Symmetry: D2
Subunit: 264 residues, 4 copies
């Protein structure tokens, strides 16, 4: 007795997955490859990026192309679009800004954060949405942050840039959904990525605590009692990119184990 | 070259799907049956309910049991729980309250709406959540309404009862997610169900317009330019019920084609 | 200086559940702006004392209704004393905390009656007169838990969220006729009830009252509890002729404790 | 009657972009409560006239700074005139409407500079003094579009939402030191700019001004546009000593037009 399970309907489509050699972006890449989506993946570090592409090719039956570039620069965006001029799916992602107190920031800190986490996604949407509209199908997913719903004092630069992206997305989403293009944001709370692990160990050593003690501290503030996985993050991305999600647009899906306490 | 696609991981589990011989509830039932979930489906009208169960059995490889009862009464809830004492998945649903002006309502109108669309789901959660916790897995999905986010003047009884359910769910969701139980709400905007079609035709005849003219009027207020399908509603339900959604809880997923204009 | 004239002197306000705490703060602030009052509470001697104090401090009239506002006969008593209010402040005691697995159907109905249907019915009874006169101000005291429900407050989370969704729909319907409906959502305010509850939970836990107060206050970014005076001041502003473009609002007075952007 | 004393007589407010419209309404309302003002705008003759009018009506001092507040030298001019404000009202002109497919990178940067980074930098320059004095009130004029973005307002949707998320984080950090940071979100207010814009879009479309006004007003449940006086009254209330438990709030003054519950 075999069960049909869920065919997301997007085999043969193409996705441009930004910032995706590791972490959540890689989780989205893998989940889309398993649905038969051909990939162009972007990251800055060439040897890690090509290793990830090797591995996804082995693990899936799709094509994978790589672009080694800084997606937050004009030249990097041009290189990504040269390699993937007409994506059906765009996953926006880039490294987040540094923590600190805004009184200690220079103006250029704001500009860099706005470029990386707001204007870069907007520009890649600008560059790709008309082809999606012309084909009657498009899926744009922006990786943002649970901080959009509950800003953290020390993350001023992210609170601002990502809330700016979110406000822009809300307006555009309603304009293009009738042409078959959806635009939605995935808001991760704390996910078990290598970057998070590296940061945790540095923070433990700076406080004098063991890594286990600091891990437990973070987890106690998450009702789910665990960190998120890049796999379940990628699964939600793949569902938003599916033919079953064409009525869902401008949404901000919070994947945070219950941590944020608001009703909405 | 066959693609893995998405295995929701819930084959062999059991779902109690309320109010599910037709419409959105039937859409959830079918989507769960395709993932290999055995069903107990509830509705009041026996012959329609048994026809739906016949059809789902033919269409899927799962078992389907029926309970013909009014789920908004104590006896009906008891009959549903006798038939499905330990569900892994609970889909809460029931008919919505009548439209009108609250100045014309009697007290009993409020009580009936609160019973049907708030206390009935709470009681079925009360009756089933401890077994979910004991097994380390539970998925509760409540069908509510886009009105929760943007209340309509003439839907006072739904605005109130469903917002009450939503507030209760937000608090409980954070309490049980660490035990493997999630509780989330699906907020439909306008979906193409037989009830909606019947209501539209009555409204057209009461206004003197053709059905096509009234259909178009409603659609012009939906940016997606179409009504929702019970299939895509069921797909979102199945994804929330999957092993890929254990980090998602207390959320209010709006499936409305962009119609509600808020950022959040 | 031309200080702020809220323009409501000589209007009449029905202030529910207002011999003490936040309701009393609303009554004091409205009387200070010249509003004649009818104040409701169950316990006669506290009610009369509070009325006497307000009347002596403000020279408005202050009628009292000793009744349980969450019952139909109580609402009839209150409406008989104030059949045509310009201003209605909805308020009543809150439901008991606990685990929803231990709440009966009747517990749910009591909470819904007290904190959702009672305000709806008082609005139902008074709004058409406000409309007819081209002015009305309805303020519902709810709870910061409407924005961030706590698991132990299931009954409040449900009933007050229901009121909040109802209010959202009605507010838009009547604002063009000069009636606004807004909710005030208190976080922790230093009412005598809260103070007594703290001192009991202190001596119960074996810590002092000051120790428990510090624990509560650590979770409030403003570093203090709210005062009934500032709660009443916000209510008076909503009631003013300056607030007729403000409706369906949920003003959080919680010292920044709720973390959400919205 | 003891009318409402907001307790801010003799404080000093820096009011940005305030020779006309909502900023002017804020300045008028604060002066009426005894607050000394420094008001900023670009055009000298309008700025002086508005200052003269406020000074004559309120007997506070009203200094003027003729500058473009969205440039670094403009901010330096404003801060030189008002280095230690108790109250800061952030405001500037809004960005142009249009299709984001036609906006350049520089268009985005101009909007972000004008409606997000300018207020952040003015907060950055003034908040530590507020903290040191144990009192501060920061009010940011944003837009009802922050709650419901319009596709033609992409630049505003982005920049003002960014400011709003930044403010949410900072508000909780400083409220314990007596500083509140809140946003006022206007829906359609009858400022002379709006009126002129309407009369041009009227004669352009071939309809009269009254016809276009009726079309706009049909979509506002309150049935009217807002007034700068009531906008300024809300700003003054937030600035008061009664509003120290209110921070990080986004008060929608839009006559009920926005349909959301929250
Ligand atoms: N993980 C969480 O708990 C969490 C929570 C909230 C928000 N977020 C946000 O989500 C995003 C992803 O986080 P993550 O933990 O998955 O990060 P990650 O583990 O560090 O992965 C980032 C990936 O993007 C690439 N990349 C980074 N900056 C890039 C750039 N300018 N151009 C091109 N590729 C770039 C990195 O490779 P190269 O370094 O080789 O370029 C790597 O492949 C970040 O913006 C983060 O702030 C994450
Ligand atoms: N469809 C939309 O556009 C839309 C939008 C917003 C909200 N909603 C809400 O979503 C829910 C589902 O709507 P729908 O359009 O799918 O409704 P539907 O097409 O009428 O289906 C309702 C189903 O539930 C059963 N049912 C109704 N009341 C019941 C009760 N007391 N006990 C047991 N079974 C019951 C009905 O069969 P019997 O009559 O035989 O019992 C039928 O199987 C409603 O609460 C509705 O108000 C729907
Ligand atoms: N203070 C806070 O921190 C806070 C925070 C969140 C929510 N709230 C909610 O705000 C409301 C007011 O709280 P509070 O602290 O001001 O309470 P309070 O100090 O206990 O004052 C309650 C007032 O209402 C009267 N009252 C209570 N139930 C009544 C009824 N059924 N009929 C008529 N009068 C009634 C009481 O007098 P009698 O007993 O003589 O009738 C008293 O005058 C409550 O619902 C509470 O749950 C308060
Ligand atoms: N009124 C509404 O319906 C409404 C609704 C939503 C949002 N908003 C936003 O609220 C703000 C105020 O709107 P309003 O209608 O009050 O505008 P207004 O009537 O045009 O007033 C703008 C005031 O700011 C000054 N100003 C503008 N840009 C400036 C700059 N760069 N530096 C210094 N002063 C500057 C103007 O004088 P100068 O030109 O001489 O400098 C004038 O005194 C705008 O950002 C607008 O987009 C307003
Ligand atoms: Cl830490
Ligand atoms: Cl209609
Ligand atoms: Cl405690
Ligand atoms: Cl127009």
């Amino acid at each position: 007795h075999h069960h049909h399970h869920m065919d997301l309907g997007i085999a043969g489509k193409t996705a441009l997955v930004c910032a995706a050699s590791k972490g959540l972006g890689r989780g989205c890449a893998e989940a889309l490859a398993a649905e038969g989506v051909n990939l162009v993946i972007v990251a800055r570090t060439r040897d890690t990026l090509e290793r990830t592409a090797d591995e996804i090719r082995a693990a899936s039956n799709v094509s994978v192309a790589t672009v080694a570039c800084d997606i937050t620069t004009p030249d990097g965006r041009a290189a990504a679009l040269a390699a993937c001029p007409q994506p059906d799916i765009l996953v926006n992602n880039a490294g987040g800004p540094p923590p600190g107190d805004f009184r200690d920031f220079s103006h250029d800190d704001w500009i860099r954060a706005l470029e990386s986490n707001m204007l870069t996604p907007i520009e890649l949407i600008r560059a790709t949405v008309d082809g999606m509209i012309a084909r009657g199908f498009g899926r744009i997913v922006n990786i943002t942050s649970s901080a959009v719903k509950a800003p953290i004092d020390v993350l001023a630069l992210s609170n601002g840039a990502r809330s700016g992206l979110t406000g822009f997305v809300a307006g555009l989403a309603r304009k293009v959904v009738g042409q078959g293009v959806t635009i939605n944001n995935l808001l991760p709370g704390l996910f078990d990525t290598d970057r998070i692990a590296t940061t945790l160990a540095a923070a433990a050593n700076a406080q004098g605590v063991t890594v286990d003690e600091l891990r437990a501290r973070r987890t106690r503030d998450i009702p789910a009692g665990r960190l998120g996985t890049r796999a379940e993050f990628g699964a939600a991305c793949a569902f938003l990119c599916s033919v079953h999600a064409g009525y869902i647009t401008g949404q901000n899906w919070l994947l945070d184990g219950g941590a944020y306490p608001g009703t909405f």
